[PDB]
């Protein structure tokens, strides 16, 4: 089912990334430029999972390279976390999108639960390969992939969670997605940025 038959029997991240370029586990590979796999190494203690590559990631071939990734950089820096010692990835690896007339970018479209279940084999291979001590789930889509489709990120902020069905029983911290911190009132944004730094420190202190 899904991407599972496209996942090779290997923990090498480069072999997995190359294989993900050939994945047809769902329909998202057709309109996307390429598959966006995770960045970082197997020594990483912290795995971070977003929703999906955006417009910038789709053509950069790397995760979190747009404005959201730059805000995440500022949050990681304030939390004293070396990005090079992370493994950063997304719940689904193909960019889902539409264009609006007058647009300045391709608009990110939300992955269905079906596409998240289809791409999960890659996330399982990534966690199996990295064996992280803690997984940071950035946003509702990533959190639900591991904690259940009914999970609410807003109701468990800053909580160290552990679910049994998860490879390696790593600690899980669900937090806001950095793209949510790009817009809104300045005081709401600044308060929300501090909440993200707090959650990143909890994950680093696991
Ligand atoms: S989104 Fe995931 S499951 Fe769907 S085609 Fe891309 S890699 Fe395969």
Residue numbers in the entry: 2 to 207
What does the study report here?
To evaluate this in more detail, we generated a Q53A mutant wherein the motif A of MsmUdgX was changed to GEAPG to correspond to the motif A of family 4 UDGs. The Q53A mutation in the H109S mutant increased its uracil excision activity. Further, the kinetic parameters of uracil excision showed an increase of >2-fold in the Kcat/Km of the double mutant. When compared with the structure of UdgX (wild type), the hydrogen bonding interactions observed between Q53 with N of K97 and O of K110 were lost in H109S/Q53A double mutant due to the absence of Gln side chain in the mutant. Taken together, these observations suggest that the evolution of Q53 in UdgX (from A53/G53 in family 4 UDGs) disfavours uracil excision activity. The Q53A mutant supports that UdgX specific evolution of Q53 occurred essentially to stabilize the R-loop conformation.
UdgX excises uracil from uracil-containing DNA to concurrently form a covalent bond with the resulting AP-DNA. However, UdgX is unique in possessing a flexible R-loop (105KRRIH109).
